[PDB]
Amino acid sequence: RPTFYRQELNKTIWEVPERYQNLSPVGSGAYGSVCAAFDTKTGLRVAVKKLSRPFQSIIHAKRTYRELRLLKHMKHENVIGLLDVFTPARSLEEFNDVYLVTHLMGADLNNIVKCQKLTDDHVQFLIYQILRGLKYIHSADIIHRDLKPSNLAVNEDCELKILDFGLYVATRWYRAPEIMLNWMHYNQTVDIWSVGCIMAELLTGRTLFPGTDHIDQLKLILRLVGTPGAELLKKISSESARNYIQSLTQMPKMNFANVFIGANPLAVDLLEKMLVLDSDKRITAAQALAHAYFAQYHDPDDEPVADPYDQSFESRDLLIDEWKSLTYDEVISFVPPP
Ligand SMILES: Cc1ccc(NC(=O)c2cccc(N3CCOCC3)c2)cc1Nc1ncnn2cc(C(=O)N[C@@H](C)c3ccccc3)c(C)c12
């Protein structure tokens, strides 16, 4: 019950509202494809993502639902906002496709560095905006766990936006050590570790830890931060992980000031606070927002938290049709922000 319209671009069929004009394949897939388009109704450039077989399996179905639920709840200036969700289906019975619309960004952070290494005052603005989005997200028990340059995009102007599944840079390069081999219990500081990795690259132009595998990755990490202290080992519950770790040639911690020569010493001190092996002593997004490095931008009366998000459904074990149905209600009940 708008004006829809087919378009076999890509190699897949796209049935979208007439308001969405100028469909341009942005690329990729596995979980679906995105196109750059123009919103006739708001006169704005947008990205339209059509999911690949949203309800093909129980994992597809839960994936779909999990994303809708999240986006619909996302209201922050540093987090990708859901502009519109739509389906060519008029009934739940013929519900087989789902599309998600967002603003079109200027570019990712991936390329921003590929072009080169940015200014310090430019890095502060970026890292601050990322951390601001993480306070929000983290406040509602949401962990990104997938932080990497391509999942960071910049506003029409210069507003940073966190997204996911952004369209060969390994996400493992930014993964915190504790979740890099089942290692053990992990919290949201897993995201902070990633941040420190992204910040370093932006400062240096090079990938901080470009491991070729999980084994090599950890090796690259323990080389910089050094092998686990006997205090950290006290908190490792797995006997195998313990043996493995202890059986490594003990590496000492490097002085970041040495690794990052010429870098803002405030920028360096933060990095020392983020790239900590013990998830328990890692700086949180909120604490880092108060760090001197961002005194220029910090504004504790403008760094908001999120309102409670219920993720009970994650626990649930339903059927394809129950996730599908639930996804339907979610599409229907959608209220366009402005
Ligand atoms: C259209 C949509 C629909 C759904 C979700 N889904 C999500 O972003 C999600 C999915 C799950 C979780 C989260 N989180 C967000 C934050 O923290 C919790 C996790 C978030 C994303 C999107 N957007 C995009 N999806 C994929 N790629 N992509 C590239 C650009 C973009 O502007 N390229 C520039 C650089 C660009 C500019 C010109 C030409 C091409 C590209 C944009 C806007 C997207």
Q: Is the CB of 164 under 6 A from ligand 1?
A: yes
Experimental method, per PDB record = X-ray
Q: Do 172 and 261 reside in the same domain of the chain?
A: yes
Q: At what angle do helices 120-139 and 265-274 cross, to 10 degrees?
A: 30
Instruction: Compute the distance between CA of residue 184 and CA of residue 180 in angstroms, rounded to an integer.
Output: 9
Per the structure, the count of domains in the chain is 2
Amino acid at 60: H
Instruction: Compute the distance between CA of residue 54 and CA of residue 34 in angstroms, rounded to an integer.
Output: 14
Instruction: Provide the token pair at 277.
Output: 């092996």
Q: Is the CB of 104 under 6 A from ligand 1?
A: yes
Q: What is the dihedral of CA 176, 181, 182, 188, to 10 degrees?
A: 10
Q: Do 158 and 269 reside in the same domain of the chain?
A: yes
The experimental resolution of this structure, in angstroms, equals 2.6
DSSP-assigned letters across all residues of 201-231: HHHHSS-S---SSHHHHHHHHHHHT-SPPTT
Q: Give strand ranges (E) for 144-187.
A: 152-154, 160-162
- As a whole number of Å, the CA-based R_g of the chain is 21
Q: Do 240 and 286 reside in the same domain of the chain?
A: yes
What is the domain-level CATH number for residue 145?
Answer: 1.10.510.10
**Cβ(25)–Cβ(9) below 8 Å:** yes
Q: Is the CB of 149 under 6 A from ligand 1?
A: no
Q: Do 138 and 241 reside in the same domain of the chain?
A: yes
Catalytic residue list:
164
Q: Do 43 and 122 reside in the same domain of the chain?
A: no
User: Which backbone phi and psi does 219 adopt, to 5 degrees?
Assistant: -60, -45
- Kindly give the distance from the C-alpha atom of residue 166 to the centroid of ligand 1, in angstroms, as a whole number: 5
Instruction: Provide the token pair at 12.
Output: 């897949």
Q: Do 133 and 232 reside in the same domain of the chain?
A: yes
Q: List beta partners, residue 20.
A: 39
Q: Do 129 and 205 reside in the same domain of the chain?
A: yes
Q: Do 132 and 268 reside in the same domain of the chain?
A: yes
Instruction: Provide the token pair at 1.
Output: 């019950």
Q: Do 75 and 171 reside in the same domain of the chain?
A: no
What is the domain-level CATH number for residue 26?
Answer: 3.30.200.20
Best of 23, 165, 169 to mutate for ligand 1, by most ligand atoms within 8 A of CB? Answer: 165
- Kindly give the distance from the C-alpha atom of residue 27 to the centroid of ligand 1, in angstroms, as a whole number: 12
Q: Is the dihedral of CA 263, 135, 234, 222 positive or negative?
A: negative
Q: Do 290 and 314 reside in the same domain of the chain?
A: no
DSSP-assigned letters across all residues of 97-144: --EEEEEPPSEEHHHHHHS----HHHHHHHHHHHHHHHHHHHHTT---
Instruction: Compute the distance between CA of residue 165 and CA of residue 29 in angstroms, rounded to an integer.
Output: 9
Q: Is the CB of 83 under 6 A from ligand 1?
A: no
Domain span at 281: 107-305
Q: Do 194 and 242 reside in the same domain of the chain?
A: yes
Q: Do 143 and 241 reside in the same domain of the chain?
A: yes
112 half-sphere exposure, CB direction, 13 A CA radius = 26
Residue 157 CB burial class (10 angstroms; 0-12, 13-18, ≥19): exposed
